[PDB]
Design a protein around this ligand. Structure first.
Ligand SMILES: CCOC(=O)CC[C@H](C[C@@H]1CCNC1=O)NC(=O)[C@@H](CC(=O)[C@@H](NC(=O)c1cc(C)on1)C(C)C)Cc1ccc(F)cc1
Length: 165
C-alpha cells in the first residue's frame, strides 16, 4: 500500500487505529483506552464515540489529521475480494498481510456478538494487531472495509469488524 495510507495507522491503546478522514478515526472496541480523559489532545466529552460491536468510531469536533484526505469506508468487501490487512508492529515494521474476504455475518466470538466479515490470510496476526485496517483498491480509490478484531486459532481465518447501516 502507499505511504499516505500507512501514515493513517497510529498506535492506539493496546492496538491501533486508522484515520479515515481528518476528523474520523476507527479502531477496535477491545483496544480503545477506557480510562482516558482525552485522545489526541481533544477532551473525550467533545469526541462523538460510536460503537457497533467491535467497530469503534471516533468523530472529532475539528479536523485533527489535516494532511490526509477522506477515504471511502464501506461495510466489508464483496465476497471473494482479496484485500490487504495493514498490520503495523510495535517495532515499527510494516507487515502487510493479504487476505481473501468471505462471509459477512453477525458472529459469536468468545460469547460476544461481533458484526463483521470472515477472511482468510493468504507470518500471521498477533494479539497487538487489533484496530489495524483492512484495505483494498477499487479503480483509483482505496477503500477501508473494517478493522482487525479476531483470528481463529488453528486456521487462517481472521475477523474484520465492520460498521452496520
Ligand atoms: C484486548 C486484549 O486482547 C487482544 O490482544 C485483543 C486483540 C486480539 C487479536 C487476535 C489475537 C490472536 N490473533 C489476532 O489477530 N483479539 C482477540 O484476542 C480477540 C479474540 C481472538 O482473536 C480469539 N479468536 C476467536 O475467538 C475467533 C473465533 C473465530 C470464528 O475467529 N476467531 C483467539 C484466537 C484469541 C478478542 C475478542 C473477543 C471477543 C470478541 F467478541 C471479539 C474479539
Amino acid at each position: 500500500a502507499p505511504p499516505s495510507i500507512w501514515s493513517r495507522i497510529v498506535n492506539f491503546g493496546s492496538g491501533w487505529g486508522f484515520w479515515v478522514s481528518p476528523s474520523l478515526f476507527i479502531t477496535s472496541t477491545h483496544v480503545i483506552p477506557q480510562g482516558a480523559k482525552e485522545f489526541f489532545g481533544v477532551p473525550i466529552k467533545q469526541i462523538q464515540v460510536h460503537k457497533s460491536g467491535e467497530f469503534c468510531r471516533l468523530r472529532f469536533p475539528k479536523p485533527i489529521r489535516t494532511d490526509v484526505t477522506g477515504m471511502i469506508l464501506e461495510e466489508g468487501a464483496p465476497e471473494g475480494t482479496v484485500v490487504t490487512l495493514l498490520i503495523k508492529r510495535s517495532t515499527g515494521e510494516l507487515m502487510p498481510l493479504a487476505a481473501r474476504m468471505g462471509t459477512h455475518a453477525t458472529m459469536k466470538i468468545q460469547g460476544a456478538t461481533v458484526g463483521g466479515q470472515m477472511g482468510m490470510l493468504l507470518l500471521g496476526t498477533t494479539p497487538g494487531d487489533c484496530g489495524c485496517p483492512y484495505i483494498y483498491k477499487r479503480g483509483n480509490d482505496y477503500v477501508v472495509i473494517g478493522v482487525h478484531t479476531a483470528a481463529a486459532r488453528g486456521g487462517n481465518t481472521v475477523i474484520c469488524a465492520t460498521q452496520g447501516s
